[PDB]
Amino acid sequence: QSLEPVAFHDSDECHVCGMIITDFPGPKGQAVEKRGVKKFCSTAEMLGWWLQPENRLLDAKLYVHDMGRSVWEKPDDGHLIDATSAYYVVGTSLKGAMGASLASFAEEQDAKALAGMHGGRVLRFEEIDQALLQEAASMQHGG
Amino acid sequence: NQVWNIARKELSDGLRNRWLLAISLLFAVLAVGIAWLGAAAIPATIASLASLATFLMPLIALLLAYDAIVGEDEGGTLMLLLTYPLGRGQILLGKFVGHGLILALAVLIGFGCAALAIALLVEGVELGMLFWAFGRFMISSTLLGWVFLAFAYVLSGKVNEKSSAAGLALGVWFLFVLVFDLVLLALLVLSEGKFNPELLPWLLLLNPTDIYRLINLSLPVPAAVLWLCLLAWIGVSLLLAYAIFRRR
Amino acid sequence: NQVWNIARKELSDGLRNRWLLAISLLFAVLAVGIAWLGAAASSIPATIASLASLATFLMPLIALLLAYDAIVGEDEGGTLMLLLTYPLGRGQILLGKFVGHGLILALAVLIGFGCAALAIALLVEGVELGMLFWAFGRFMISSTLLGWVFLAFAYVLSGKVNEKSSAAGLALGVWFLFVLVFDLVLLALLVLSEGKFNPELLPWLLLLNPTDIYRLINLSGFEGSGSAMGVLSLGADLPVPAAVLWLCLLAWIGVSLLLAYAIFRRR
Amino acid sequence: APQSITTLPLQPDGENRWRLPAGEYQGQFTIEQPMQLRCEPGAVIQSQGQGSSLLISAPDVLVEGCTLYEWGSDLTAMDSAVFILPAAERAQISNNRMRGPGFGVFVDGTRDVQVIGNEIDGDAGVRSQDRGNGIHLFAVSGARVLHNHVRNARDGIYIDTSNGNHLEGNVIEDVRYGVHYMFANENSLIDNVTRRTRTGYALMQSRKLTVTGNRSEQDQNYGILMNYITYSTITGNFVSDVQRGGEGKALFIYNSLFNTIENNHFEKSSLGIHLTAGSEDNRISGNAFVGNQQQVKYVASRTQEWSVDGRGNYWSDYLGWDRNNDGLGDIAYEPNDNVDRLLWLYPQVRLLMNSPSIEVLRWVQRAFPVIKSPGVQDSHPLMKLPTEKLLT
Amino acid sequence: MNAVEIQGVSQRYGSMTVLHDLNLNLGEGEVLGLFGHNGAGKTTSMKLILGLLSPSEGQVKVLGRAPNDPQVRRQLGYLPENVTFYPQLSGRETLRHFARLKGAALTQVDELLEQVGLAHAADRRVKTYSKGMRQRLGLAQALLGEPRLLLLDEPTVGLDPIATQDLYLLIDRLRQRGTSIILCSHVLPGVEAHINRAAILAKGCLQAVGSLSQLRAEAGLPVRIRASGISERDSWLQRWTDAGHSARGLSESSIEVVAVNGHKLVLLRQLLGEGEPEDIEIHQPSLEDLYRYYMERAGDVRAQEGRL
Amino acid sequence: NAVEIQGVSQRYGSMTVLHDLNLNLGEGEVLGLFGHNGAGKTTSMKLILGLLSPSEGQVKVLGRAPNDPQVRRQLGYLPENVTFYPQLSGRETLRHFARLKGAALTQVDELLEQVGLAHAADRRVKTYSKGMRQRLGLAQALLGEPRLLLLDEPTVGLDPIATQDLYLLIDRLRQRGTSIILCSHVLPGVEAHINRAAILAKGCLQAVGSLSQLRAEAGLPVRIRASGISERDSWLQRWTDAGHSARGLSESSIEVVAVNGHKLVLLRQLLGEGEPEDIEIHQPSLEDLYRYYMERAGDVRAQEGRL
Ligand SMILES: [Cu+2]
Ligand SMILES: [Mg+2]
Ligand SMILES: [Zn+2]
C-alpha cells in the first residue's frame, strides 16, 4: 500500500514545521510509509527529514512534484513522481516555502532549462546531503 | 488427600531454607528502595517493579525447586516415598502446591512492603487504582513464578545428580530472562528486512518473562489471551514434568 | 618439596573442572570481543578501562570458583583429616593449594590477554608494539595479582565455615561486595553527600577494595576521557605513586593469606 | 467605505489632534490625514462585518484608545481591523480593544510603526485556519510592537521578512502559534509570555536575531521551534510543561547551525531538547534541564560537546558529586545511552523496553565503555541552578 | 499363609536378563536374608517386592495381592540403604510427615521416637544428626502403623554395638507378633544369629535357600570339632582315622577332630556317651564360610592369599 | 613396642573426654578399639596419629614422637568415609598419595592390582561406588610398607567376598610384622581376626586383653543353641523352670543359656532324650562381652524393645 501517493488537502500541516502546506509555492514532498502518510511543506524540508538516521532504515516511498509539467506557484497533485529518480535543481532565485529552493523534475533537460535560466546546477537525489542543504539555504536567504 | 499432606512438608522445609530467605529479604528491600526512589524522586514505578520481579521471581522459583526431584533421589527418600500409598503424580503436584504457596507468600512480603512504601510516601496516590494495579501485579508475579517452578521440575527429573541440576537451572534462568530478549534485539540490529516487524509481538508469546511484562503495561493481541497464554505455560510444562517424572 | 607435590594435584584438578573451562573460555572470547570493538571504532583509553573492567568481573569469579571448597571441600570430603597424617604441615597444604590454584589463574589470564593481544596486533594496522607489549604486560602481571587476592580470600572463607553449602554462600557474598557493591556504596556516599562528606578521606577508601587498586594500576597511563572512570575519578586525588599501588595489591595478598593460615592453624 | 472625517471628532488641540466622543458608529473608516485622534472609553467603532474597519494611509498618525468590533473576514483581500499602508510611516496604534474574525493589526511596507498595549480577542468558532493573524507584520524595518494582549487569533504575531523590530512584553494566549517568524533577519523579541499554544515560538529561516527572556506556560507539543536559524542568541527563555496534543518538546532545533543557547530553563516537558542530526556544533551551555522525562534526543553517533569555556548545564538527573568546591560537576554527563537511541531508531523495541536484558544493557555501557556510542555529553556540568531568577 | 510369593519371575532390562528364574516363598513369621555380590539380583528383587518395578516374565504376590495396591503399602515398612532425610526439617516433624502419608495415628509418633531411642534427639534438625542417629529415624518410619512386612536394606550401618543388638531384639519381638521381615546386609556375621533362612543368590539365579542347618548339611563345608576333657587320651584319640576323619591329636588334654559334617557332630550319643566329655566347645562354620562356597559354585574363582 | 600410650588424660574445655589410659600395643598384635558413648574411640585414635596434642601424658608411637615425619611414612590410616577427589582418576589419586608419603612409583601400579581395582583404574572417582572408594582408601594405607596400620571401619559398604579377603590381607600383614588397629562398630565379625580387644567407655579404658582373657575376667555362661527338636514348647517349659533364659526363634529351633556347670547335665537331655538334628555351643562372643563391660561401668540396660 506504499505505492500510492495521496493527494494534498488545504488542512494539511507539514510534518516538521507544522504550518499549512498549500499556502506556499514550490514543489511539496510527501512520504508514504504504508503505516501512515506524513507530508512536508517543502522538498528541502523533506530532504532534511530524510537524511536523519531515524529515517535511513525506514522503508518508505518518497514522492515529490513534477515541476516540468506544472506551474510553480500552484503545483497540482496529479503527476507526482518518485523522489529518488528525480533531477533537483538548486541555487535558483525562486522563493520556496522553508529550505532552499529545490525544484524537482523528471526529464533533466527542463531541469537543465531552469539551471541555465537562473544560474543553478542540476544534481541527483543521492548527491543531496546535509552539507549541501545548509550551504544552499545560506546563499538563498542570507546576505 | 495426600497432595496436601506432602504439601505441608514443602512449606515447612522451604521456609527454613536460608538461601531462600536471603533472597526474599533482598527482594523486599529492593522493592522498597525502588518505591522510595520512585516516589521521592504509579505506572512509572510499576514498570521498574516489573523489571525487578522479572529478575528475582524466576530466581526464587529456581532456588526452591531445582532439587525437588533429584534432591530427593540423591537423598534416597524418593525411592522410599514411592513405596508409600502415593502416586508419582501426587508427589509432583504436592510439591507444586507446597513450593507454589512459598513464592505466593514471597510476593506478599515483597509487594506488601512495596505498596506500603507507596501508600505512605506519595500522599495522594489515589489508592483505588493501587489495589487493582497491585492486585493484577501480585497475581501475575505468582504466575510468572509458577512457570519457573514448573520449569524447575522438568530439569530436576531429567538429570541424575544435584550438581548438574544447578548447572541447568542457571542455564534456564539465563535463557529465559536475558538471552531470549537479547536475541530478539539482535535480529533487529543486524538487519531490518530479514525479520518482519509485525511478527515480533507474536514471538513474545514464546517467553513467559515477556508475557509477564505485557500484562503489566495495561498491542495486536488482547489482554485476555496473555492470561490464558501464561496459564498455558504452566499447564504444558507441568504435564511435561509429569511425563518426565514417570520415566525415572 | 611437598609444596610442589600437592600443587601438581590442584593443577590437574582445576583443569578438569568443566565450570572453570566454561568461564575461562568466556574470558577469552570477551577479551577478543572488546578488543575487536576497540579496533573497529578507530578508542585506545576506552578499550583499556573496559578490559580492566572485564577482569574485575571474571578474575574474582574464576578465583572464587576454584578455591571456595579448598579447605572445607576437603574437610567434609574426609580427605583433609587423612592428609594431616601424611608428612606435611598445615602451612604446606595451604601454600601448596595457593601455588596450585595460582598457576591456573596465571594460565587463565595468559590465555585471555594473550589472545586479546593477538586480536590487536593482527587487527589494527600500525599499532605501537612497544606500547602494546607494555600495556598488556602490565595487564598480565596485575590480573594474576587481583586473582591471587581473591584466591587468598577464598581460603579465609573456607577455613571459617564447616559446611561446603555455606561456603558457596559466603563466596557469593565476597564476590558481590568487592566487585559491584563497594563501587556502589562509595557512589551513593558521594551522591547523597554531593561530595561534601570528606574531601580528603574519600580517595583513601579506594585502597580498601582490591578491585579498585587493580583498576588504578591499569588506568595509569591511559586516562583519556573522564566519564569512563566514574567512581574511579578519585584516583587523581590519591597522592600515592604507581609503585605503592603495586605494593597495596601485594599487601592485600599477604595479610589475607596470613589470616588464612592463622584461621587454618586452629581449624 | 466612509472616512474618519465623516464622523464628529471634537478637537482638544488645534494641531490636527482630534477626540472622538463616546457612542457607537457603523461601517468602515479611512484615515487619509495625519490625525492624532484619541477616544473616550465608550467609542465602540463597530463595523457591520465587512471590509477593513480602520484603514490608514497617512504618515504620523497617533491612533489611541479606540475600540473596534466585527470587521470583515476575507483574508485574501486582507480584511483587517487596522490596515496600515506602506505610505503610512511611523504610525502609533496605542491601547485598543478589538474583536473580529480577521487580522487585528495588518501592516505592510511600513517603517517605525508602533503597536503598543492593545487587546485583540480574535475568534471563538473558526477552526484556527481562517481566524487571521493577531499582529501581522509584512517586511517592516523599525517597528516597535510592545506589551499587547492577543487572544484566540490564528498564529499570533506573524512576521514575514521584517528586519529590525522589538517584541517586548506581550501576552499571547490560546492560539496555534505564539510568535511566527519568516525570514526576519536581525530581529529581536524580549520577555513575551505564551500560554496554551500549539507551538510557542516559530523561528523559521530568520537569522541573526535575539530571543531573550521569553516564557512559555503549558504549550502544546512544541516549546520553541527553530528551523534554519543562524547566528542567533537564545538567552534566558523559560519553557515550562510542554504537554502533548509531537509528544511535547521544550526546544526543537532543526537545521540551526550557529547560535548560542544559554541560561534557559526547560521544565517538566516530555522532551527537554530535540537536536536533529543536521544541527550540530553550536554553543549550548548554562541551561537548566529540570523535570523532563527525557532530556536530550540526539539520534547520531557523532560526539557533541555541550560546554563552552568549561561551564556546562544543570541537569536534574545528574547523579554526580563535586569534591573541589567550584560550581562544576566532577564527572561528565552523558544524557543518552546506546539503548536509549535504539528505541528511537527502531520503534519495535518499545515492547522490549521493560525487559531485564535492557536493564542489563544499561549497566554494560557503564562498565564497558567501548560499546558507548559517542553522544551528546557535556564535560563539567553544573551542580546548582543557574536560572535562580527565572522561576519567579 | 505366605507374605511374599515370588512365583517364577524373570526380570530383564533389554536383551540382558539381570534376574533369571527366581522362586521364593517367605513364611508368616520368618526372617529372610537376601545376599548378593555380583549381579543386581539382590537389588532388583528388592524392587520387585515393592511396587517400584514390574515383573517382566512372572508375578509377585505380596500379602496375597498385587505389590502396588494401596492396601498393601499401608502395612509394609521399608528402610532403604544410606537414606538422608530432609535436613532442614526436624526429627519429630519428619515422622509426623511420614505418619500422615501412611495413615497411622499421631499418637504412635511420640511412642516410636521413644521406641527407637530418639527422645533426646527429637526436635532437632536432621542435618545435626549422626549416621547412626539417622538410622534410628529411618527405622522408626518403617514401624509406623501396624506393618506386616519389613524390608531392611542394611539396617545396622553406623549404629552403636549396643543399639545393633537391641535392633535385632526389636526384630525378634516383631516376628513373635507375626510380622515376617526381610534383611539385606553385607556384613554376614551378626545377621546369622537372627536370620531364619538364608537366600544366598549369585549373579542371575538363586543359588540356595533354606535355614542354616540346611545349608551346612547340603553344602559340604568343614566343621571344627575341638574338644577338651579327655577320657584316656589314646584309644579315643586314634579311632577317628578309620572312621573317616583326620583328627589332630593334641597332647594337652584336648582332642581336635575335623569332620565332613555328614557324621554330623555328637552323632547320636557317641561323642558324649562314653561318660566323661568335660567341657567341650563347638566352633561351627559361619554364614560367611557358606557364602564363599556358593560363590565358587557358580563362577567367581577365589583370589590369592591377600588381595582384596 | 609399637604403640605406647602411657598415662594420657586428654582434656579440652576442662571437660576430660579421655582419662588415664595405659594402652601398650605389641609389635605383631592386632588391636580392636570399640567405643559407644565416650569419645575415647575417636580421641585416642587421633592421639596415635599425631594430629592431637596429649595433655598430661605421653604418646610414644614406634619408640619415637607421634608427630615426627620419619614415623608418618611408616603409618597408614584409613579414615571413616572418604570421597577423595571426584574429578581425578584412580591411578592419579593414588599417585598423588604416592608422592606425599615418599613411596616409590613402582608401588602404585602393583597396589591397584593387589586391591581389585585395576579394571576400574584410570576411571574417575565420581563413578566409584562406596565399596570401590573403600578399596581405594585401603590402597593408600598399604603404601610404602607401613609398620602400623590404623583402620576406621574398613568394611563398610563392601561386598562379603572382599570383606573376607581384606582380613586375609590383614593376616598376611600381621605375619610380616605390622601391628594393626581395627577401630570398628560391627563387632560380630571382627572378633574372628583381632588378637586383643580394648573396650573403652566414658573415657576410662574398661578392659584390655585377648578374648580368652576377657572371658576369664567376666563370668559369662556358654550359649547352647539346638535345632531340629521334636516340639518347641516341650523343652521351653523346662529350661525356664531350671533357671535358664530361653527364647524361641523358629518352628523347631531354640537356644539355651547354661551356667557353665549345668551345660553338660542339660546336654545329657539333648542327645539321649528326643534327639534333634543339630547342636551349636557358643562361647560368650564380643557382642555379649561388650554389653557386659558397658553395663558394668556406667550404662543401664534398656527395655525389651526400646532401642
Ligand atoms: Cu512558517
Ligand atoms: Mg571540580
Ligand atoms: Zn513544512
PDB file of N, CA, C and O and ligand atoms in Angstrom, chain A residues 17 19 24 98, chain D residues 158 180-182 202 204, ligand 1:
ATOM      1  N   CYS A  17       7.680  21.581  10.289  1.00  0.00           N
ATOM      2  CA  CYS A  17       7.351  22.940  10.697  1.00  0.00           C
ATOM      3  C   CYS A  17       5.899  23.097  11.088  1.00  0.00           C
ATOM      4  O   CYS A  17       5.549  24.084  11.738  1.00  0.00           O
ATOM      5  N   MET A  19       3.189  23.989   9.693  1.00  0.00           N
ATOM      6  CA  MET A  19       2.318  25.020   9.164  1.00  0.00           C
ATOM      7  C   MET A  19       1.641  24.515   7.895  1.00  0.00           C
ATOM      8  O   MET A  19       1.901  23.409   7.421  1.00  0.00           O
ATOM      9  N   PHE A  24       1.770  27.916   0.023  1.00  0.00           N
ATOM     10  CA  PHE A  24       3.130  28.185  -0.400  1.00  0.00           C
ATOM     11  C   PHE A  24       3.329  27.805  -1.857  1.00  0.00           C
ATOM     12  O   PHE A  24       2.591  26.974  -2.389  1.00  0.00           O
ATOM     13  N   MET A  98      10.239  26.540   2.902  1.00  0.00           N
ATOM     14  CA  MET A  98      11.098  26.534   4.074  1.00  0.00           C
ATOM     15  C   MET A  98      12.578  26.551   3.725  1.00  0.00           C
ATOM     16  O   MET A  98      13.260  27.527   4.018  1.00  0.00           O
TER      17      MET A  98
ATOM     18  N   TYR D 158       2.407  37.092  13.485  1.00  0.00           N
ATOM     19  CA  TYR D 158       3.088  36.632  12.292  1.00  0.00           C
ATOM     20  C   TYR D 158       4.000  37.740  11.809  1.00  0.00           C
ATOM     21  O   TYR D 158       3.622  38.911  11.800  1.00  0.00           O
ATOM     22  N   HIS D 180       5.262  33.845  15.167  1.00  0.00           N
ATOM     23  CA  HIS D 180       5.737  33.233  13.939  1.00  0.00           C
ATOM     24  C   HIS D 180       6.746  34.149  13.270  1.00  0.00           C
ATOM     25  O   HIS D 180       6.506  35.351  13.138  1.00  0.00           O
ATOM     26  N   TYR D 181       7.866  33.585  12.852  1.00  0.00           N
ATOM     27  CA  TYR D 181       8.937  34.331  12.215  1.00  0.00           C
ATOM     28  C   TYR D 181       9.240  33.722  10.860  1.00  0.00           C
ATOM     29  O   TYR D 181       9.496  32.523  10.766  1.00  0.00           O
ATOM     30  N   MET D 182       9.206  34.532   9.813  1.00  0.00           N
ATOM     31  CA  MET D 182       9.521  34.069   8.468  1.00  0.00           C
ATOM     32  C   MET D 182      10.513  35.044   7.861  1.00  0.00           C
ATOM     33  O   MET D 182      10.141  36.181   7.553  1.00  0.00           O
ATOM     34  N   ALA D 202       7.656  29.980  16.750  1.00  0.00           N
ATOM     35  CA  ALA D 202       8.099  29.504  15.450  1.00  0.00           C
ATOM     36  C   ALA D 202       9.236  30.388  14.971  1.00  0.00           C
ATOM     37  O   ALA D 202       9.050  31.588  14.763  1.00  0.00           O
ATOM     38  N   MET D 204      11.439  30.386  11.954  1.00  0.00           N
ATOM     39  CA  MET D 204      11.644  29.761  10.656  1.00  0.00           C
ATOM     40  C   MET D 204      12.468  30.692   9.781  1.00  0.00           C
ATOM     41  O   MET D 204      12.010  31.788   9.442  1.00  0.00           O
TER      42      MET D 204
HETATM   43 CU    CU G   1       6.288  29.486   8.885  1.00  0.00          CU
END
